[PDB]
Paper text:
By targeting its receptors C5aR1 and C5aR2 on a wide range of immune cells69 as well as endothelial cells10, C5a promotes inflammation, vascular permeability and coagulation. Mirror-image aptamers, also referred to as Spiegelmers (from German Spiegel=mirror), possess the high target specificity of conventional aptamers and are in addition plasma nuclease resistant, therefore having high therapeutic and diagnostic potential. Here we report the crystal structures of NOX-D20 in complex with either murine C5a (mC5a) or its C-terminally desarginylated version mC5a-desArg, at 1.8 and 2.0 Å resolution, respectively. The structures reveal a complex 3D architecture for the Spiegelmer, including a left-turning double-helix and an intramolecular G-quadruplex stabilized by a Ca2+ ion.
Residue numbers in the entry: 678 to 746
Write the structure that this text describes.
């Protein structure tokens, strides 16, 4: 994968969340890289819509970057 680009793009998106809790949701989302899809994995995130959106968007960004490497 392109870990330098990955870091950069996740930083870009994480900066949009203005609290450390949804920031962490983003960062955790971007770590998703096993057999579960972003949709499957986010289904178990239960701390609110912002957290869910952050997880989703960062997981999707990370997935795109890994696929394109
Ligand atoms: Ca912190
Ligand atoms: Ca977690
Ligand atoms: Ca605990
Ligand atoms: Mg935990």
């Amino acid at each position: 994968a392109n870990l330098h680009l990955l870091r950069q793009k996740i930083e870009e998106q994480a900066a949009k969340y203005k609290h450390s809790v949804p920031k962490k949701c983003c960062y955790d989302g971007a770590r998703v890289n096993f057999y579960e899809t972003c949709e499957e994995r986010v289904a178990r995130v239960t701390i609110g819509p912002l957290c869910i959106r952050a997880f989703n968007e960062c997981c999707t960004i990370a997935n795109k970057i890994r696929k394109e490497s």
